[PDB]
Amino acid sequence: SGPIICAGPIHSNKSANIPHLLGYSEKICQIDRLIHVSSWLRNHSQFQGYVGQRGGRSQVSYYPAENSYSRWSGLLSPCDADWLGMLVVKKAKGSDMIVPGPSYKGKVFFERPTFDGYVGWGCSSGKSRTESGELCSSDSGTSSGLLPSDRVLWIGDVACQPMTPIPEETFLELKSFSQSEFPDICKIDGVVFNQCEGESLPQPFDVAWMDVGHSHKIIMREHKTKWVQESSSKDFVCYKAGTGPCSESEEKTCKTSGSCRGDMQFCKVAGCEHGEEASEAKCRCSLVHKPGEVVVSYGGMRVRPKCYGFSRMMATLEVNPPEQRTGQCTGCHLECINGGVRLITLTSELKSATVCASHFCSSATSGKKSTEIQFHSGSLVGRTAIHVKGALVDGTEFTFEGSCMFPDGCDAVDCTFCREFLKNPQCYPAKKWLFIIIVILLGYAGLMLLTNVLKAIGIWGSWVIAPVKLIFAIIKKLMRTVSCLMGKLMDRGRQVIHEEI
Amino acid sequence: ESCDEMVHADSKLVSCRQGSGNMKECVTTGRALLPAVNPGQEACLHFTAPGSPDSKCLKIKVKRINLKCKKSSSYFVPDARSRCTSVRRCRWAGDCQSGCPPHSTSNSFSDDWAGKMDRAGLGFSGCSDGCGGAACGCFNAAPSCIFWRKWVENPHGIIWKVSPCAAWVPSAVIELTMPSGEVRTFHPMSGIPTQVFKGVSVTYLGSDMEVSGLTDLCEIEELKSKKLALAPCNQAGMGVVGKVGEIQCSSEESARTIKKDGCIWNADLVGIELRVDDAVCYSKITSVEAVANYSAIPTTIGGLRFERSHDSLGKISGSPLDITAIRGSFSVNYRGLRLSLSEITATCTGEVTNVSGCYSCMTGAKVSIKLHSSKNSTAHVRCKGDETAFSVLEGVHSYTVSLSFDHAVVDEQCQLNCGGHESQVTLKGNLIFLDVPKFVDGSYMQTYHSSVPTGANIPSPTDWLNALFGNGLSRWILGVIGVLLGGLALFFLIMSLFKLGTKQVFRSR
Ligand SMILES: *[C@@H]1O[C@H](CO)[C@@H](O[C@@H]2O[C@H](CO)[C@@H](O)[C@H](O)[C@H]2NC(C)=O)[C@H](O)[C@H]1NC(C)=O
Ligand SMILES: *[C@@H]1O[C@H](CO)[C@@H](O)[C@H](O)[C@H]1NC(C)=O
Ligand SMILES: *[C@@H]1O[C@H](CO)[C@@H](O)[C@H](O)[C@H]1NC(C)=O
Ligand SMILES: *[C@@H]1O[C@H](CO)[C@@H](O)[C@H](O)[C@H]1NC(C)=O
Ligand SMILES: *[C@@H]1O[C@H](CO)[C@@H](O)[C@H](O)[C@H]1NC(C)=O
C-alpha cells in the first residue's frame, strides 16, 4: 500500500549530495524515499534540507483525498517520470494562476499539470504557504530542519508511462473533433482554442485529459479505457533481503543466465533453473503490483497515451449580448381593394397576421409578400378602424393601424331577403318596377286558369269512379236482406213442425 | 367615445369625503352584472354621487372571445442523445475480486468517471462480466470485470415548452380602464378571476360549448423558431414511455444542459449491451417532432379551425366556422377604487348634426353631436330606447355615439345633460336595413359572436311603395288604380293575335 522497495528514510546530513545512480532498479528504490522533491529543491530552489521525514511515499497528501490510482503502488507520478527521463517540467511562470483547491497552510511544495505541461511551486527556507497561496509567509515552525511528508502536495490523479508515437496526421483529426464537443470554451490559460471575439473571467473546472506529446494535450469527456497487464520484457523491479537492490551486473545477467531464484511468474518467463542450493538467493523477487497500462479507444482509432489524468483547470466561457431586437416592419402600408384590406410587407415574407375589423376578425393566408385578406361579404359599410397585429420571419412583431372608404348605403344584392324590406335604393333604383310588372302579370295569368275550372269543373271526370264504390256499398247493404229471410224461414219451419203438440 | 348596455352601477354605498381644494373624493364597494355584448362594442359602469353633479365611467371593451385552453402545469423538454463510457480491469489487484463485492453497486468504486463533472447529466453506473485470459489481456483465467456508465447529452440546443391541459373553456381579451386615465388589457377565463389591478376584478361566465373530439392534448411550442403544434402528452411528474415527456424538466436554466438535480427522468431509455471488452449503447427515445397525432399550425380538428393567435397568455386559439353564438356575461367586483368629483356645475349645451347607419343591426346607428363645454364632465345622453355616455372636452368639439333604433324614421327627443345643465336636443334622419353577413370562401373567422338579431324579418307596408308611388293618402289609391289599369288593356288586346301563334301547331302548316 505504498511501500515499494523498502521503508522510509531517516537521513542525518544537514545538506547531503544525493549522488546520481545509473541502475534503473536503484532509481526505483530511490523514488520511494521521497528524493525527487529534494532534487527539485536543492538544484534550483537553493533550499537546504530534506523532505519526507520518516514518512515514505504512501503518506503524501492528495487533494482529491479518497481517490483511485493511489491504493496501488506501481503507478508513476509525474515527478518520478520526469526523473526517469521524459519531458522536463517547466519552470514556474507568473502568468499561471493557482486553482482554489484545498488548504495550503502548512504545505511547502506542490505541482499542477497545465495545458502546456507540468508546473511546480514552492518557497525558500523559513517560509511556508499561507491559507490562500499568494505569498510565502515566514513561520518559526518550519525552522527545525526537518519537513514531514504531508507538507508535499500533489493535485489531481495521474498515471504516466512510456507511449508509442503516432504520425501527426492521426493526431490533428483528434484536436478538431474534441473542439466540436464544447462550443463554449474559447481560451484556456492564454492558449487560443477558437475564435469568439470575446472573453470572460476564468473559472475553475474539473476535467480529464490525455497526453500524446505532439501539442497542448487533449481534453477528455467521453472515452473507453482498457487495462492491459502486458509485462513483456521489463516490468519487474526488486531487491535483496535487507541489503536492498542488487547490482546492475546481476540485473543484466539474470535475464540471460541460468539458475535464478524468483517467483513462479518471473520463473515461467525468465528461463529459471532449479537444483540443490542453500540460503544464497540471487536477488529473488516477483512482479510489481500495478494494474498495468492504459489504452484509449476514442471512436475508431486507438492510441496508447503518455499521460492520463483527471484534475482541475482554468478556462473561460463565451459571452454574447444577443439582445438587439428589430422593431416593426419597414414602411408597410394598408390598402383597401374590395370587401377586404390588402397587407403589404417589404422587409420579408409574412408568417401569420390577424386583421381586426370593426366587428369581425380574420387570419392571413401567409406565404407571400402582398397577401390578400377577405372578410365576410355583406357587412363592411361605413368608416372602419382597421388594426393589424402579427409576426414576420426572423423574429419581428409588428402592429399597424389605418382605414379606408367603403360604401355607406350600398348593398347590391340580386334577389334575397335583403331587398324586400328595402325598396328605396335597392342598388338600381329602377328595379322594383320589373318585380311589380312580373308579379302582376303572373297574378293575372294565375287566375285566368281558375275561371276555366269554375265553369268547367275537373272533378266530374272523377265523378264516375266514386259511384262505382257507391254501387258496391249499396250491393253490400242490400246483401243482408237475404239471410234474415232464409234463416228466419228455416227457423219458422222448424218451429211449426214442433208446434203441433 | 361611446358606451352601451348601461347598468347605472350602484349608489348609496359610496362614502363621501372633503378636502384639498374641492375634489370631494370617494371610495366604493359593490358589484355589477354588465352584459357581454359583441366584440367591438363596450359595456360601462356609470357611477354617481348623491351630492356632487359629476360622474365617472368604467368601460369594458372586448376584442377577441376565442376558445383558448386552460393550464394544469408547464415544463420544458430538451432533446437528448445517448452517450456511454466503459472501463475494463483485470483480477490481479486488491480492489475487485468477483464482480460487485456487495449486494448492490454503491457510489462509483472508481475515479475519472464522467459523473463528477458538470455537464454529465443523470447516470446509472453498472458492472458486468466480460472475457478474461491471455487472448483478452488478463493474467488470470477468470472472467474480467467491466464497469459502464450511461448518460444523455444535449448538443444543438432546442428547448420545448409544454403545458398539459384538457379543459378548452371559452375565454376573451378585454381592455379595462380606470375612471381617471388608466388603460390595461388582460384576458379573463370562464370561471377564474384576473387578479386585482387597482381594486377591480372582472370575471367572465360562458356557456361551456362542448367540442366534438378532444382527448388529452397538449400545446407544444419551440422557443427558437416559434413553431406550435398539438400533441398528446402526460401529466406533470410521472413519465410514461411512448409520448413526449420522458426527459421532464421544469427550469429553463438546467433544461438545455441536463443536470443531475432539478428534474426527474425514467430508466429503460439508455439501455446498454456489453460486448467482449467494451460497451456501446443505442437510444430508445423518440423526438417530439414525430410521435403521434403531431399536427401543425393550421388544423381542422373537429368542427373548429385551430389557428395561431399572437398574444401573451395561451397562444393557441380555436374558432367557429360560420357565426355561432355564446351567451355569457361579466361580473365586475370592485373593492377600493377611488374616484374624484369636481363638485362644480358648468355650462353644457349642444345639438345633433346627423344620424346614419343600420336598421335593427349588429352595430346600431351612429349619431353625431356637437358640444360646447367648459369642464371635463361626462354626458348622459338618454332617450326612449338605449342611453349612452362619453367624455366631453374643453371648448367646442364633436362626438359620435351609437343608438339602436327600430323603425325607418327617427323623430324622437333626447334629454342630454352633462354635469348640471339638463337640456333638450332633437334627432332626424333616414335609415336602411342590412341583414346578417353571409359566409364567403377564403375567410377564416376567429371570433365567437355573442349576439345575433333574429325574429323581426318580415316585409312591411307604408314603405314598400314610398319609392314606388307618390306621397299621400289619395295618391296611394290613385296610383293603385293607375297601375292596375296600366296593362289590362295591353294583355287583353293580344288575345286576337294569340290564336295566330297558338293554332299553328294544331292546324295546317
Ligand atoms: C539535479 O542535480 C544533479 C546533480 O548534478 C543532476 O544530475 C546530473 O545529471 C546529468 C544528466 O542526467 C549527469 O550527466 C550528471 O552526471 C549528473 N550529476 C551528478 C553529480 O551525478 C541533475 O540533472 C539535476 N536535475 C535537474 C537540473 O533537473
Ligand atoms: C554527509 O555526511 C557524511 C558523513 O556521513 C560527510 O562525510 C559528508 O561531508 C556529508 N555531506 C555534506 C556535508 O555535504
Ligand atoms: C391519433 O390518431 C389515431 C388515428 O386513428 C387515433 O386512433 C388515436 O387515438 C390518436 N392518438 C391520440 C393520442 O389520440
Ligand atoms: C355627418 O356629419 C359628420 C360630422 O361629424 C360628417 O363628417 C359626415 O360626413 C356626415 N355624414 C352625412 C351622411 O351627412
Ligand atoms: C380636462 O381635460 C383636458 C383634456 O382631457 C386636460 O388637458 C385637463 O388637464 C383636464 N383638466 C384638469 C383640471 O385636469
Q: Confirm or reject: Cβ of B393 under 6 Å from ligand 5.
A: yes
- Long-range (24+ apart) CB contacts under 8 A made by B135-138 are B136/B276, B136/B277, B137/A226, B137/A227, B137/A228, B137/A229, B137/A230, B137/B90, B138/A229, B138/B90, B138/B91, B138/B92
In order, the DSSP letters of A44-97 are: II---SEEEES-TTTT-EETT-S-SSSS-SS---HHHHHHHTSSPPPPP-TT-P
Let me know how long chain B is. 509
- Best of A203, A422, A438 to mutate (most B CBs within 10 Å, chain B): A422
Assess if residue A180 is contained within a domain: no
Residues A340 and A454 in one domain: no
- Residue A217 in any domain: the answer is no
> B39 and A227 in contact by Cβ < 8 A?
no
**Is A59 domain-assigned?**
yes
**If you measure from the C-alpha of residue B100 to the centroid of ligand 4, how many angstroms do you get, rounded to a whole number?**
94
Last residue of a domain, one of A400, A418, A437: A400
Structural domain count of chain A: 3
Closest ligand to B244 CA? 3
Closest Cα of chain A to B434: distance in Å? 7
Q: b/e map of A206-240 (b: 16 or more CB within 10 Å)?
A: ebbbbbbebebbbbbbbbbbbbbbebeeebbbbbe
Measured from the CB, is residue B342 less than 6 Å from ligand 5? no
Closest of B111, B106, B144 to residue B126, by C-alpha:
B106
B3, amino acid identity: C
**Per-residue cell: B114:** 464522467
Distance B432 CA to ligand 4 centre (A): 16
DSSP class per residue in B338-366: EE--------EEEEEEEEEE-SS-SS-EE
Which of A131, A157, A183 corresponds to the end of one domain? A157
Helix, coil or strand: residue B391:
strand
Residue A469 DSSP SS3? helix
For residues A354 and A473, state if they share a domain.
no
Q: Which residue, among A222, A307, A388, A437, would best test binding to B if mutated, counting the most B CBs under 10 Å from its CB?
A: A222
Q: Does A133 reside within a domain?
A: yes
Residue A478 corresponds to which cell in the numbers above? 242490400
Q: Are A252 and A14 in contact (CB under 8 A)?
A: no
**Cell matching residue B242:** 411512448
Would the CB atoms of B487 and A441 count as touching at under 8 Å? yes
- Domain termination site, one of A134, A157, A180: A157
d(CA B177, CA B186): 11
Same-domain pairing of A90 and A139: yes
Interface contact B226-A408, CB threshold 8 A: no
Q: Do A396 and A435 fall within a single domain?
A: no
> With a 6 A CB cut-off, is A179 part of the ligand 2 pocket?
no
Task: State which of A20, A35, A83 you would mutate to test the pocket of ligand 1, scoring each by most atoms of that ligand within 8 A of its C-beta.
Answer: A20
Cβ proximity of B234 and B218 under 8 Å: no
Residue nearest to atom 4 of ligand 4 (CA): B368
Q: How far is B414 from chain A (nearest CA, A)?
A: 24
The nearest CA of chain A is from the CA of B419 a distance in Å of 31
Question: Helix (H, G, I), strand (E, B), or coil: what is residue B280?
Answer: strand
In a domain, A96, yes or no: yes
B89, B138, B447: residue with CB nearest A360: B447
Q: What distance in Å separates the CA atoms of residue A480 and residue A292, rounded to the nearest whole number?
A: 131
C-alpha of B388 from chain center = 28
B232 lines ligand 3 (CB under 6 A): yes
Q: Is residue A280 part of a domain?
A: no
Residue A153 and residue A32 share a domain = yes
**B291 shares contact with chain A (CB less than 8 Å):** no
DSSP A196: -
| Residues B218, B233 contacting (CB under 8 angstroms) | yes
User: Measured in Å, how far apart are chain A's first and last C-alpha atoms?
Assistant: 154
What does the alpha-carbon distance between residue B335 and residue A245 come to, in Å, rounded to a whole number? 96
Contact B137 A228 (CB under 8 A): yes
Angle, vertex CA B383, rays to CA B377 and CA B388, nearest 5: 40
CA-nearest residue to B42 within chain A is A359
Specify if A170 maps to a domain. no
C-alpha B63/C-alpha B401 separation (Å) is 19
Q: How many CA atoms lie within 13 A of A291 on its CB side?
A: 25
List the domain range (segments joined by +) for residue A460: 428-478
* In a shared domain, residues A40 and A139: yes
Answer yes or no: are the C-beta atoms of A128 and A143 closer than 8 Å: no
**A28 and A153 share a domain?**
yes
Cell 347607419 belongs to which residue? Answer: B357
Q: How far is CA A218 from CA A118, A212, A294, B83, B86, in A?
A: 14, 8, 16, 19, 19
Sheet holding A152-154: strands in order across?
A61-62, A152-154, A109-113, A118-122
Do A34 and A80 lie in one domain? The reply is: yes
Print burial letters for A308-342: b (CB count within 10 Å at least 16), e (below 16): bbbbbbbbbbbeeeeeeeeebbeebebebeebbbb
Chain center to CA of A492 = 120
d(Cα B172, Cα B65) in Å, to the nearest integer? 4
Q: Are strands A152-154 and A109-113 parallel, antiparallel or unpaired?
A: parallel
Say which residue the cell 342611453 belongs to. Answer: B387
Same domain, A30 and A148: yes
- Distance set, CA B402 to CA B387, B423, B491 (Å): 9, 20, 51
State the distance from the centre of ligand 2 to the C-alpha of A22, rounded, in angstroms: 21
Q: What is the DSSP string of A339-366?
A: SSEE---SSS-EEEEEEE-SS-EEE---
- Cα torsion for B483, B486, B489, B491, to the nearest 10°? -90
What percentage of chain A's residues is helix, strand, coil (to nearest 5)?
A: 25, 20, 60
CB of A45 within 6 A of ligand 1: the answer is no
A437 in the same domain as A350: no
> Radius of gyration over alpha carbons of chain B, in Å?
38
Buried b (16+ CB within 10 A) or exposed e, B116-142: eeebbbbbebbebebebeeebbbbeee
Q: Which atom of ligand 4 is nearest to the CA of B368?
A: 5
By Cβ distance, the residue of A157, A206, A421 closest to B460 is A421
Please tell me which of the candidates B111, B466, B484 has its beta carbon nearest to residue A69. B111
Distance A15 CA to ligand 2 centre (A): 8
> Which residues are within 8 A (CB) of A201 and not within 5 positions of it... i.e. 6 or more apart?
A316
Q: Which of residues 223-262 of B touch A (CB under 8 A)?
A: 226
What's the CA-to-centroid distance between A330 and ligand 1, angstroms? 77
DSSP strand pairing (A396-400 vs B15-16) = unpaired
CA of B293, closest atom in ligand 3: 1
Pick from B436, B320, B330: nearest CA to B66:
B320
* Candidates B117, B118, B445; nearest CB to A361: B445
Q: Does B498 touch chain A (CB under 8 A)?
A: no
Which residues does ligand 4 sit against, CB inside 6 Å?
B 353-354, 356, 368, 398
How many angstroms is it from B424 CA to the middle of ligand 5? Answer: 26
Rounded CA separation A82/A85 (Å): 5
- How many angstroms separate the Cα of B277 from the Cα of each of B115, B132, B283? 21, 9, 20
Helix axes A432-444, B473-493, angle to 10 degrees: 60
Q: How many CA atoms lie within 13 A of A111 on its CB side?
A: 23
In a domain, A323, yes or no: no
Counting ligands in written order, which one lies closest to the CA of residue B240?
A: 3
